[PDB]
Amino acid sequence: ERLLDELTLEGVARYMQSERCRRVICLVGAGISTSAGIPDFRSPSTGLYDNKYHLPYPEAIFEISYFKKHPEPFFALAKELYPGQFKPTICHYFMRLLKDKGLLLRCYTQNIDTLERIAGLEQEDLVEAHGTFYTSHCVSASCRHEYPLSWMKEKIFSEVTPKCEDCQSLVKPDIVFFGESLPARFFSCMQSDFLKVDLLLVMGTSLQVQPFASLISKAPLSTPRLLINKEKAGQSDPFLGGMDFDSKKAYRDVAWLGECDQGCLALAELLGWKKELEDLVRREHASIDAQS
Ligand SMILES: Cc1cc(C)nc(SCC(=O)Nc2ncc(Cc3cccc4ccccc34)s2)n1
Ligand SMILES: [Zn+2]
């Protein structure tokens, strides 16, 4: 009774091009941006937090109340970690193709780098589960003046603590600090989207950070779930208690292990989309390289 004829990338592609598959939800994380030269900010082994701030504890750099009273460490770190270029990956442009072809219901992302937007996903297509640098707001509840990334970038590089032009309050990028809630939009969209989904495409996430990881359990029981990731992820934790790729009871979950770009390339090829994807990426990359 299962929807995939076989538990392979080939099976997923046949399903995608069948009448049964109309709405795809993508769940994406840091693994879709590493090939764009953006490291994984949640990892301690990427050396981003290797080093004067006098933090009452090392975690305070991520905490909202600390930020509000001592914003300088955050903004110094933001300058240090600011990417040299913003060129979305093959994986990002694969999602743009999903959008173009009327298959994209939603992209839920853990990333803050804005590459989904640069690749042409719109606000309505996105749930930025950990917020984004794309916009920043004055922290004063009575004001909330919104500032674009161009404005915020200028403040970060000039090492001027960003203050609101209307009220002189601190201006904070719309990323979710420890102590802040996840965006309201995350919960709203989750409630509706997973009633409507035909395929989950899970790319570049290890599914270890909650509540993002729990999204896979919101899929209907029949909905195929394809993981494209360097490592297998999402199975039940044998210590406590999921994806089932390999047991005799597996029926809908498929793992393609490798670089996300290569997995998306392989899937696009099966779909007859490889030329379209190559043409889109090369054109967009050229346009970004040519920014004058
Ligand atoms: C600075 C910048 C600007 C743009 C457009 N894109 C990037 S992507 C590269 C990157 O990893 N950067 C980062 N900026 C801040 C980081 C740590 C951090 C600290 C405190 C709170 C956090 C709240 C939520 C998330 C992280 C938080 S990592 N980086
Ligand atoms: Zn203000």
Author numbering: 56 to 106, 109 to 298, 306 to 356
From the manuscript:
NAD+-dependent protein deacylases (sirtuins) constitute a unique class of enzymes that are conserved from bacteria to humans. The human isotype Sirtuin 2 (Sirt2) deacetylates both nuclear and cytoplasmatic proteins and thereby functions as a major cell cycle regulator, a determinant of myelination, a regulator of autophagy and a suppressor of brain inflammation. In this work, we present the first crystal structures of Sirt2 in complex with a potent and Sirt2-selective small-molecule inhibitor with drug-like properties.
We solved the structure of Sirt2 in complex with SirReal2 and the cosubstrate NAD+ (structure termed Sirt2–SirReal2–NAD+) as well as in complex with SirReal2 and an acetyl-lysine peptide derived from histone H3 (residues 11–17, structure termed Sirt2–SirReal2-H3). Both Sirt2–SirReal2 crystals belonged to different monoclinic space groups and contained one monomer per asymmetric unit. Our structures feature a completely new and unexpected Sirt2 conformation, where SirReal2 functions as a ‘molecular wedge’ that traps Sirt2 in the open conformation even in the presence of an acetyl-lysine peptide substrate. We call this a ‘locked open’ state. The position of SirReal2 in the EC-site of Sirt2 is very similar in both structures with either NAD+ or the acetyl-lysine peptide substrate (r.m.s.d. of 0.47 Å), and we will primarily describe the binding of SirReal2 in the presence of NAD+, as this structure likely represents the SirReal2-inhibited form of the enzyme. Structural comparison of the available Sirt2 structures with the Sirt2–SirReal2–H3 complex can be found in Supplementary Fig. 3. In particular, the side chains of Phe235 and Tyr104 that usually cap the acetyl-lysine are rotated towards the surface of Sirt2. Surprisingly, this rearrangement does not prevent Sirt2 from binding its acetyl-lysine peptide substrate, but deacetylation and the domain closure is blocked effectively. The hydrophobic acetyl-lysine–binding tunnel is not formed in all Sirt2–SirReal structures, since Phe235, which usually caps the acetyl-lysine, is rotated ~90° towards the surface. Further thermal stability experiments indicated an additional stabilization of the Sirt2–SirReal2 complex in the presence of either NAD+ or a peptidic acetyl-lysine substrate. These findings were the key to a successful crystallization of Sirt2 in complex with SirReal2 that was only achieved in the presence of either substrate or cosubstrate.
